[PDB]
């Protein structure tokens, strides 16, 4: 075969030091109360668990004719295999969903972004998955109907009782969480742009009505007040931080100034209402730089979120889609009447999914920004 051994040797040699460092970094992120540290820690643990058994396989392909270890060794490798294959999908999905909640509903779902909750979610995911794939251990009939005990591969022919289970495993274990990841990504872009659908309308309302007041007053001020109030609501769509406290304050000042201009417009003093409206320029000019600095710290944060969502989609598509396509085709090729090309490609493609164990740790450079910190550490070590 040659290719499988080469890929597996590469995955062990790179993935083990890499996953050990990634696990340490995830722990450090958890200690900092970064909710994404738990999912990354669970992925790193699932990976280290998977990798530690792979050398026996590799040895089988490199130096031995058959499975000298006995049938007992195929049950655990397979189980472990399927575990690694799915757990990493379930956690990549959990990460994408968490990020969408963090962007689309920052306050209504704040209770779901605590570390304790992420831990409970991890516990539920592990117990549910491990249970779902635990049956072949309880009973053997399956394990024998699906595998040739003399070599840890699945029978070239397949029987029912599993012919449909493989479809269940592709529709629920792949298409479902993948569609959820794509939907999460779309939802993030829509919420963000829609966050570009409310403030620009408010800024234009305020700026153009002010232009009207200076040339024309009650009507323009009435519209400005409504826009100013909605701009505060936008401030409150985000969690508290000193800049949000300051923007709400700035708006209370702006609204009060609009009200003084209205008082004068109601009295009927156009010149005075206009002079009062001009103080809205003095006020907005006090917050322009703050707003601009604040948005830059946003565009970069959104860039990181979008890149993470896209990277997760690309990881699932490249590492797992080839097997789920060949597995679905292989099952489909049996629901009735080339055969050998499907097998050959499927078995080569089964080695490919082991690359998830190398791509995963890369996510640490996207989640936080301690990537730069680690680079500095390495430079210092040098």
């Amino acid at each position, epitope marked *: 075969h040659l290719f499988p051994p080469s890929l597996y040797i590469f995955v062990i040699g790179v993935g083990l030091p890499t996953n050990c460092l990634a696990l340490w970094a995830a722990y450090r992120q958890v200690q900092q109360r970064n909710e994404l540290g738990v999912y990354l820690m669970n992925l790193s643990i699932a990976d280290l668990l998977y990798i530690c058994t792979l050398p026996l396989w590799v040895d089988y392909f490199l130096h031995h004719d058959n499975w000298i270890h006995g049938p007992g060794s195929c049950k655990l490798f397979g189980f472990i295999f399927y575990t690694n294959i799915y757990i990493s999908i379930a956690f990549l999905c959990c990460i994408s969903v968490d990020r969408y909640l963090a962007v689309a509903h920052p306050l209504r779902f704040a209770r779901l972004r605590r570390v304790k909750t992420a831990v409970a979610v991890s516990s539920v995911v592990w117990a549910t998955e491990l249970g779902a794939n635990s049956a072949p251990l309880f009973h053997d009939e399956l394990f024998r109907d699906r595998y040739n005990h003399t070599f840890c591969f699945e029978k070239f022919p397949m029987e029912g009782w599993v012919a449909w289970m493989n479809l269940y495993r592709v529709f629920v274990g792949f298409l479902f969480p993948w569609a959820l990841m794509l939907l999460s990504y779309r939802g993030i872009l829509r919420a963000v742009e829609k966050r570009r659908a409310d403030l620009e309308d408010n800024w234009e*309302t305020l700026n153009d009505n002010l232009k009207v007041i200076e040339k024309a007053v009650k009507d323009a001020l*009435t*519209k400005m*007040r*409504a*826009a100013a*109030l*909605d701009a505060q*609501k936008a401030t409150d769509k985000s969690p508290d931080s000193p800049e949000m406290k300051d923007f709400r304050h700035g708006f*209370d000042i702006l*609204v*009060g100034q609009i*009200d003084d201009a*209205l*008082k004068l417009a*109601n009295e009927g003093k156009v010149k005075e209402a206009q002079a009062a409206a001009e103080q809205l320029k003095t006020t907005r000019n006090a917050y322009i730089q703050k707003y601009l600095d604040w948005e830059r710290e946003r565009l970069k944060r959104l860039e990181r979120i979008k890149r993470l969502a896209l990277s997760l989609i690309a990881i699932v598509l490249v590492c797992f889609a080839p097997y789920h396509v060949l597995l679905l085709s292989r099952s489909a090729i049996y629901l009735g009447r080339f055969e050998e090309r499907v097998f050959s490609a499927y078995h080569s493609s089964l080695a490919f999914t082991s690359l998830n164990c190398v791509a995963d740790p890369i996510l640490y450079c996207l989640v936080n920004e301690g990537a730069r910190s680690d680079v500095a550490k390495a430079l210092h070590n040098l």
Partner: antibody, heavy 124, light 109 residues
Framework: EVQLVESGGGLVQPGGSLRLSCAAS????????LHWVRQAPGKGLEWVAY????????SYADSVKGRFTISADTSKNTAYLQMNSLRAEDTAVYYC?????????????????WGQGTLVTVSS | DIQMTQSPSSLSASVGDRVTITCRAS??????VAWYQQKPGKAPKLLIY???SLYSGVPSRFSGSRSGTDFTLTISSLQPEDFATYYC??????????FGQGTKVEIKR
């Protein structure tokens, strides 16, 4: 206890006048804006007048401009609505209501407290 | 000048039934719409303020929301005590206060 208590309604002939009162308890008149809301028999609610004694700001619905005067005297914790030159169309129940000042919840919460209302009937 | 229009001027519903009252602003109004419940002979009581939040003391049966200029009041399950006239009110400014015409919830028969 938070109360708004209206008084001074009754029967007036067209062209005549009434002085309605709105006494406050719990809160002072100067602590909030007072509004009069009118409800003609069988009709929905109409805003009529506003006073903010903390700023000296008043306003009126177009239907009563130059006809009604709104004032308040915080030393008795009481507000008043002076209704001059009344027309038949001014028959209604007049309610006094409390709406606080911007910023914050006292403003977003609008007419949280209403008084009992008093009937003004204008008829020859 | 900021008119509010309530659509279901009369709504019939059973006790335990779901009631939705829709109100439309003529122009943009921030979430500054309140809902009031008036029973015959009584001053209106505030139910919902800021087009969302309940006023303390108001049953959880009541809720509402804003979608652009469209505001709604929902009674998740009518109780015998909820057959009242509901009013939609706009509060952008002290002098601009307007009310919708009111919608009456009647007992279905």
């Amino acid at each position: 206890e938070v109360q708004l208590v209206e008084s001074g309604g009754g029967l007036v002939q067209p062209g005549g006048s009434l002085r309605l009162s709105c006494a406050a308890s719990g809160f002072n008149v100067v602590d909030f804006s007072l509004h009069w809301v009118r409800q003609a028999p069988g009709k929905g609610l109409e805003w009529v007048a506003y006073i903010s004694s903390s700023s000296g700001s008043t306003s009126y619905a177009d239907s009563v401009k130059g006809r009604f005067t709104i004032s308040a005297d915080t030393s008795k914790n009481t507000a008043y609505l002076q209704m001059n030159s009344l027309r038949a169309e001014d028959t209604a129940v007049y309610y006094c209501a409390r709406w606080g000042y911007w910023p914050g919840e006292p403003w977003w919460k609008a007419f949280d407290y209403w008084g009992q209302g008093t009937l003004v009937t204008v008829s020859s | 000048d900021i008119q509010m229009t309530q659509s279901p001027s009369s709504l019939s519903a059973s006790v335990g039934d779901r009631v939705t009252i829709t109100c439309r602003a003529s122009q943009s109004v921030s979430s500054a719409v309140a809902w009031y419940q008036q029973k015959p002979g009584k001053a209106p009581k505030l139910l919902i303020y800021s087009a969302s939040s309940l006023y303390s003391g108001v049953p959880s049966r009541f809720s509402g929301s804003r979608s652009g200029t469209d505001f709604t009041l929902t009674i998740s399950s009518l109780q015998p005590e909820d057959f009242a006239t509901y009013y939609c009110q706009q509060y952008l400014y002290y002098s601009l206060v307007t009310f919708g015409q009111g919608t009456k919830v009647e007992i279905k028969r």
